[PDB]
Amino acid sequence: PTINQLVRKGREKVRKKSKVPALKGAPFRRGVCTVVRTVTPKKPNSALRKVAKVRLTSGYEVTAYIPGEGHNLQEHSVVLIRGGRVKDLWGVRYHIVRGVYDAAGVKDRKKSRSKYGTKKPKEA
Amino acid sequence: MLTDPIADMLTRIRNATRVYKESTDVPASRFKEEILRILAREGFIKGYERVDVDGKPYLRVYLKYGPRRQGPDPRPEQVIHHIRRISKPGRRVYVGVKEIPRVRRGLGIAILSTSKGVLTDREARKLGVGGELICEVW
RNA sequence: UUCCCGGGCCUUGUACACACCGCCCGUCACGCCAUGGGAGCGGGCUCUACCCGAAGUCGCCGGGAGCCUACGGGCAGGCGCCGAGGGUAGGGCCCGUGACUGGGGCGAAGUCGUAACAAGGUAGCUGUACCGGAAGGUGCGGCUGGAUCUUUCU
RNA sequence: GGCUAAUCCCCCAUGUGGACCCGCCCCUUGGGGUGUGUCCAAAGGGCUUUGCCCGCUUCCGGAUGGGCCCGCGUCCCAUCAGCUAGUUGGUGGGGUAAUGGCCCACCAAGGCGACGACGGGUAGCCGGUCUGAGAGGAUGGCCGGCCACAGGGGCACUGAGACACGGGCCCCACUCCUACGGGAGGCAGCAGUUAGGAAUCUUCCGCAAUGGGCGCAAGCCUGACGGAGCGACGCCGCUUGGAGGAAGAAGCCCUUCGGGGUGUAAACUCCUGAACCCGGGACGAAACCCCCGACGAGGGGACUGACGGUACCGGGGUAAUAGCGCCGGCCAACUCCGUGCCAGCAGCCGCGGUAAUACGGAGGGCGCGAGCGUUACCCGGAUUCACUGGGCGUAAAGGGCGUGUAGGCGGCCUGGGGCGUCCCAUGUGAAAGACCACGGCUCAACCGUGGGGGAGCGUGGGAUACGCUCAGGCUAGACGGUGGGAGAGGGUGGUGGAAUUCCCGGAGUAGCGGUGAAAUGCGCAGAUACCGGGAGGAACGCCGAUGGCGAAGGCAGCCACCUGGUCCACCCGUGACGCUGAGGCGCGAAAGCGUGGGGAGCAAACCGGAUUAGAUACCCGGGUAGUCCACGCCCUAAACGAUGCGCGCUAGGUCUCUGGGUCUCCUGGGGGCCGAAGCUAACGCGUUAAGCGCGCCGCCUGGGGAGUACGGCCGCAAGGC
Ligand SMILES: [Mg+2]
Ligand SMILES: [Mg+2]
Ligand SMILES: [Mg+2]
Ligand SMILES: [Mg+2]
Ligand SMILES: [Mg+2]
Ligand SMILES: [Mg+2]
Ligand SMILES: [Mg+2]
Ligand SMILES: [Mg+2]
Ligand SMILES: [Mg+2]
Ligand SMILES: [Mg+2]
Ligand SMILES: [Mg+2]
Ligand SMILES: [Mg+2]
Ligand SMILES: [Mg+2]
Ligand SMILES: [Mg+2]
Ligand SMILES: [Mg+2]
Ligand SMILES: [Mg+2]
Ligand SMILES: [Mg+2]
Ligand SMILES: [Mg+2]
Ligand SMILES: [Mg+2]
Ligand SMILES: [Mg+2]
Ligand SMILES: [Mg+2]
Ligand SMILES: [Mg+2]
Ligand SMILES: [Mg+2]
Ligand SMILES: [Mg+2]
Ligand SMILES: [Mg+2]
Ligand SMILES: [Mg+2]
Ligand SMILES: [Mg+2]
Ligand SMILES: [Mg+2]
Ligand SMILES: [Mg+2]
Ligand SMILES: [Mg+2]
Ligand SMILES: [Mg+2]
Ligand SMILES: [Mg+2]
Ligand SMILES: [Mg+2]
Ligand SMILES: [Mg+2]
Ligand SMILES: [Mg+2]
Ligand SMILES: [Mg+2]
Ligand SMILES: [Mg+2]
Ligand SMILES: [Mg+2]
Ligand SMILES: [Mg+2]
Ligand SMILES: [Mg+2]
Ligand SMILES: [Mg+2]
Ligand SMILES: [Mg+2]
Ligand SMILES: [Mg+2]
Ligand SMILES: [Mg+2]
Ligand SMILES: [Mg+2]
Ligand SMILES: [Mg+2]
Ligand SMILES: [Mg+2]
Ligand SMILES: [Mg+2]
Ligand SMILES: [Mg+2]
Ligand SMILES: [Mg+2]
Ligand SMILES: [Mg+2]
Ligand SMILES: [Mg+2]
Ligand SMILES: [Mg+2]
Ligand SMILES: [Mg+2]
Ligand SMILES: [Mg+2]
Ligand SMILES: [Mg+2]
Ligand SMILES: [Mg+2]
Ligand SMILES: [Mg+2]
Ligand SMILES: [Mg+2]
Ligand SMILES: [Mg+2]
Ligand SMILES: [Mg+2]
Ligand SMILES: [Mg+2]
Ligand SMILES: [Mg+2]
Ligand SMILES: [Mg+2]
Ligand SMILES: [Mg+2]
Ligand SMILES: [Mg+2]
Ligand SMILES: [Mg+2]
Ligand SMILES: [Mg+2]
Ligand SMILES: [Mg+2]
Ligand SMILES: [Mg+2]
Ligand SMILES: [Mg+2]
Ligand SMILES: [Mg+2]
Ligand SMILES: [Mg+2]
Ligand SMILES: [Mg+2]
Ligand SMILES: [Mg+2]
Ligand SMILES: [Mg+2]
Ligand SMILES: [Mg+2]
Ligand SMILES: [Mg+2]
Ligand SMILES: [Mg+2]
Ligand SMILES: [Mg+2]
Ligand SMILES: [Mg+2]
Ligand SMILES: [Mg+2]
Ligand SMILES: [Mg+2]
Ligand SMILES: [Mg+2]
Ligand SMILES: [Mg+2]
Ligand SMILES: [Mg+2]
Ligand SMILES: [Mg+2]
Ligand SMILES: [Mg+2]
Ligand SMILES: [Mg+2]
Ligand SMILES: [Mg+2]
Ligand SMILES: [Mg+2]
Ligand SMILES: [Mg+2]
Ligand SMILES: [Mg+2]
Ligand SMILES: [Mg+2]
Ligand SMILES: [Mg+2]
Ligand SMILES: [Mg+2]
Ligand SMILES: [Mg+2]
Ligand SMILES: [Mg+2]
Ligand SMILES: [Mg+2]
Ligand SMILES: [Mg+2]
Ligand SMILES: [Mg+2]
Ligand SMILES: [Mg+2]
Ligand SMILES: [Mg+2]
Ligand SMILES: [Mg+2]
Ligand SMILES: [Mg+2]
Ligand SMILES: [Mg+2]
Ligand SMILES: [Mg+2]
Ligand SMILES: [Mg+2]
Ligand SMILES: [Mg+2]
Ligand SMILES: [Mg+2]
Ligand SMILES: [Mg+2]
Ligand SMILES: [Mg+2]
Ligand SMILES: [Mg+2]
Ligand SMILES: [Mg+2]
Ligand SMILES: [Mg+2]
Ligand SMILES: [Mg+2]
Ligand SMILES: [Mg+2]
Ligand SMILES: [Mg+2]
Ligand SMILES: [Mg+2]
Ligand SMILES: [Mg+2]
Ligand SMILES: [Mg+2]
Ligand SMILES: [Mg+2]
Ligand SMILES: [Mg+2]
Ligand SMILES: [Mg+2]
Ligand SMILES: [Mg+2]
Ligand SMILES: [Mg+2]
Ligand SMILES: [Mg+2]
Ligand SMILES: [Mg+2]
Ligand SMILES: [Mg+2]
Ligand SMILES: [Mg+2]
Ligand SMILES: [Mg+2]
Ligand SMILES: [Mg+2]
Ligand SMILES: [Mg+2]
């Protein structure tokens, strides 16, 4: 565009759209399980993925992954939403944080403890 | 009507040299002459002379090239590799003295028009004045 | 040497490359997600017109209808304008829930079509118009972004 | 209701001076001087009471701190385009410290807006901060400056100053008290409670320091502050040892059973001595005050701590926390086992269905280390909104075409001005921060002192090339004149022949027609084929091109009239009159709409016949709208060169249309094809540029959702933008 054209009109700044209205801006959000169930992932993969419906302190309702080996979450439990997606599932935009509230850390996991929220084992 | 006679002259030179013409006619004016004189002194052209084509003033510009080359494509190096208008009608750039740019680490030149007259970058700095930044050449 | 089967070479088109036993479009059904229209109803704002109108400032009166007085006036008090806010009437706009309804998006992968890609088997595309529930068909005009009877499916 | 003091209130006086009206002078907005008239002052207290202190009154100036005013800069939406009645201005007045529609009266009819008014959304602004090579983007916590608010809203009083957080009045909501009449409250002060939340501290110490208020002082007050406490929240320093120690223990892992690894790692040897105990133990503090001096200057002298018995110094003195992420590629680090499209992983591509360096554990390894990861958010990368620094023939992207408004841009020569532009000086650019230097805490973080830099703006001076401007001049652009052209360019009227259909007549039988083959259909009321005549409508064979014209859509028989564009020669006239062009306005194939006509052929819809598994379709027989004319709408398109307009510049060859020329050829203007340089992702483009440049307009920013929804404008509707 001619310079006079930019003076007239000017470049336009590109707005960014939130991939996560966990929101109220927050990093994490407390919520309550509605359903706890499994789902069947996208085309190239097969498994039973573990998810939960959550009502939120934000007054929001979202599907959340329940990462780990075992999971104790039940229908009425309270839980902390992490954010970040599960790619081969549908519209699951958030993960549940293990170790806090009613979601206990993965039983007997020795390697990456922080993700999965389990404390340090014992030594002989 | 040329919309930018200066850009037009520079471009004529560019096209001329790119086909290895011995010389090129640009329609004459004082300002064009000053720009030329600068080139000629800097060695980008052999020189220029005034001439009447169809009883009209023109500046005939004698271009300058490298020695013949070897291998495929014997065509010689250009003495003017790069000739470019900076300030154009419709965006006119003017620089202060602290802003007069070093061109190609000194191997090139910038031509400014100042109230001391048409200078090169070095000329302008040493004279301590800025002005309109006309073109880059290298 | 036309034809049938298999094959070789050159060329052309191709949306195929698991490579035509290919690909894609589309319909009905099944599962979820977001959305449009939307009767009626819940709350909000805003303007305009009219009515009510606190406090206070200002203006007027302040009178043998009050208080003070050095008779110059002062205070109390009354009235008025303004005025927060309230009501009424209508106009406009924003959320909320919403009977009923339109497509859309995905999804295991089912259903029946065979429109498009090879001249895809009626060349395709297109604006418009009519017909069909829809894919599509046809009319008219345009484009080359076209190759040298019917007769399926994998 | 009554008593009473004052530095409380009021009256006369003195008028240094001052205020006001009027006159005069100088300055020029209401600044300064002057004269007459008028009007306005005061407060007392303490002392060693003969002199001094603390005060009081009027005036002039200073200083500091504010009010008001102007230029410029200050986010998103045009699906917000028109907004405005004290609105815009005037005279007079009110009000204030003061200008002002700040307010009222009267008069005029104005003011603002595409350079974005009005509307909606969001938001305290800045010094700075984060990021970035920079430009830029993002942000404004803490600290400094300004603004604003003190539960919501309005209002004023008091005062130098407020429309007043811990002042007042009223209204509303809320909490409490209530004898039901009525009252009381305001932590966005410190600390603390509670609710909400992913989440944010002690109801600490102290007036010792700095600062603030009052007081002559002594002194009092100060949740400002100076500290301490809590939280790896950040930054910085420090520790978990140091040296010796195997041709290399055990355990654990790999094993080709030969061995390889963890690894000098450990044990162990020696050495040092974080923690810890003892002792000493601050700086921050010198004034206020006392003495001499005159309550001064000067000189001298003494009191004064939360932090704290802390930091620190001296003596003693124990080997004394390590974890967290990763190890398929991006990316530094590989093997074994378990699991078998499971369980799981996952930032992206992807990994897992029997050898998994990708899941889980183990060994080992890499990276950081009192931390390491994660999520969220900002810049980055992203040249992915491209000023630096991008694009549009086929990838997204040239507007259907024109006319032109605003605006943007502008040939050659001369002169004036000096607005842009440039240069010097100067003021401003607070402090903090950033930078540099030196220094202070053992270092650093942190801090001090100093230096420099700095866009922008104000004032003064200078320069004149370029841009602007004014004045003059030229003719190379542009238009004109004269004289030649070629043309399906447009409008109007007329006219010609071939053909189809129908009607009339002659002659003439038995079929014609149609398809792959057929059938419907037409023919004994005589068709088809042949001849003659009539009527009507629509379109123009050959010429015809690989041609011409037009801005595009588009334009083809012949004739006449009206009319647009354009090319060449002459070089005659004007003298930059130019280019582009948001809006606007006009044109705009076909189909479609309205009112009237017209109707031969063709023909969506439709009615039939075949083909087919089926048919709505492809083929066949009919057939209405429509196609044609008038007038008025519609405004789309593969409206295509999928290529905006103009200008200059950069090899040729070849065919062609149309001018001029001394006509092989050359010289203009068109249409094509190959191809220089060059360009391009390639295909291709190449003097008809997709090359090299300049001006202006339009347009693009992953694919879908979608040219959809909502809004608005237009339209009779369809539907368009
Ligand atoms: Mg919500
Ligand atoms: Mg030459
Ligand atoms: Mg500057
Ligand atoms: Mg064969
Ligand atoms: Mg062979
Ligand atoms: Mg081969
Ligand atoms: Mg072949
Ligand atoms: Mg093709
Ligand atoms: Mg493929
Ligand atoms: Mg395949
Ligand atoms: Mg009233
Ligand atoms: Mg009264
Ligand atoms: Mg009223
Ligand atoms: Mg619905
Ligand atoms: Mg097909
Ligand atoms: Mg078809
Ligand atoms: Mg076809
Ligand atoms: Mg069609
Ligand atoms: Mg229909
Ligand atoms: Mg049909
Ligand atoms: Mg067609
Ligand atoms: Mg395409
Ligand atoms: Mg085609
Ligand atoms: Mg069949
Ligand atoms: Mg009394
Ligand atoms: Mg009393
Ligand atoms: Mg008395
Ligand atoms: Mg008094
Ligand atoms: Mg007196
Ligand atoms: Mg006097
Ligand atoms: Mg002052
Ligand atoms: Mg909208
Ligand atoms: Mg009004
Ligand atoms: Mg006042
Ligand atoms: Mg006035
Ligand atoms: Mg303006
Ligand atoms: Mg706000
Ligand atoms: Mg930086
Ligand atoms: Mg900002
Ligand atoms: Mg601050
Ligand atoms: Mg308020
Ligand atoms: Mg209040
Ligand atoms: Mg309030
Ligand atoms: Mg206030
Ligand atoms: Mg308070
Ligand atoms: Mg809570
Ligand atoms: Mg604290
Ligand atoms: Mg103190
Ligand atoms: Mg003090
Ligand atoms: Mg005092
Ligand atoms: Mg403090
Ligand atoms: Mg050692
Ligand atoms: Mg071993
Ligand atoms: Mg020892
Ligand atoms: Mg001391
Ligand atoms: Mg001390
Ligand atoms: Mg004495
Ligand atoms: Mg002294
Ligand atoms: Mg010690
Ligand atoms: Mg020792
Ligand atoms: Mg040890
Ligand atoms: Mg690697
Ligand atoms: Mg992992
Ligand atoms: Mg196995
Ligand atoms: Mg295995
Ligand atoms: Mg495998
Ligand atoms: Mg592994
Ligand atoms: Mg991995
Ligand atoms: Mg692993
Ligand atoms: Mg390890
Ligand atoms: Mg550290
Ligand atoms: Mg960028
Ligand atoms: Mg960059
Ligand atoms: Mg983008
Ligand atoms: Mg650019
Ligand atoms: Mg810049
Ligand atoms: Mg691009
Ligand atoms: Mg076009
Ligand atoms: Mg103009
Ligand atoms: Mg010029
Ligand atoms: Mg100047
Ligand atoms: Mg300066
Ligand atoms: Mg500074
Ligand atoms: Mg400093
Ligand atoms: Mg910086
Ligand atoms: Mg030091
Ligand atoms: Mg510093
Ligand atoms: Mg100046
Ligand atoms: Mg001069
Ligand atoms: Mg001049
Ligand atoms: Mg101009
Ligand atoms: Mg002139
Ligand atoms: Mg003529
Ligand atoms: Mg014609
Ligand atoms: Mg005609
Ligand atoms: Mg006839
Ligand atoms: Mg007959
Ligand atoms: Mg007969
Ligand atoms: Mg019959
Ligand atoms: Mg019959
Ligand atoms: Mg006949
Ligand atoms: Mg007829
Ligand atoms: Mg022909
Ligand atoms: Mg055409
Ligand atoms: Mg004509
Ligand atoms: Mg003519
Ligand atoms: Mg002449
Ligand atoms: Mg003349
Ligand atoms: Mg134009
Ligand atoms: Mg226009
Ligand atoms: Mg049309
Ligand atoms: Mg039509
Ligand atoms: Mg009609
Ligand atoms: Mg027919
Ligand atoms: Mg049939
Ligand atoms: Mg038919
Ligand atoms: Mg395109
Ligand atoms: Mg287009
Ligand atoms: Mg362009
Ligand atoms: Mg040619
Ligand atoms: Mg000739
Ligand atoms: Mg030509
Ligand atoms: Mg080439
Ligand atoms: Mg190439
Ligand atoms: Mg070519
Ligand atoms: Mg050219
Ligand atoms: Mg040329
Ligand atoms: Mg061109
Ligand atoms: Mg290109
Ligand atoms: Mg998208
Ligand atoms: Mg459309
Ligand atoms: Mg309508
Ligand atoms: Mg349509």
Curated annotation (Swiss-Prot), chain B:
Matches recorded under PROSITE patterns: RIBOSOMAL_S8
Higher taxonomy: Bacteria, Thermotogati, Deinococcota, Deinococci, Thermales
Gene Ontology terms for molecular function: rRNA binding; structural constituent of ribosome
Disulfide bonds: none
Quaternary assembly: Part of the 30S ribosomal subunit. Contacts proteins S2, S5 and S12.
GO cellular component terms attached to this protein's record: ribonucleoprotein complex; ribosome
Official protein name in the record: Small ribosomal subunit protein uS8
InterPro entries: Ribosomal_uS8 (IPR000630), Ribosomal_uS8_CS (IPR047863), Ribosomal_uS8_sf (IPR035987)
GO biological process, one term: translation
Family of this protein: Belongs to the universal ribosomal protein uS8 family.
Keywords: Ribonucleoprotein, Ribosomal protein, RNA-binding, rRNA-binding
Residue stretches in coiled coil: none
Purpose of the protein: One of the primary rRNA binding proteins, it binds directly to 16S rRNA where it helps nucleate assembly of the platform of the 30S subunit central domain. The combined cluster of proteins S8, S12 and S17 appears to hold together the shoulder and platform of the 30S subunit.
Gene3D superfamilies: 3.30.1370.30, 3.30.1490.10
Presence of keyword Chloroplast: no
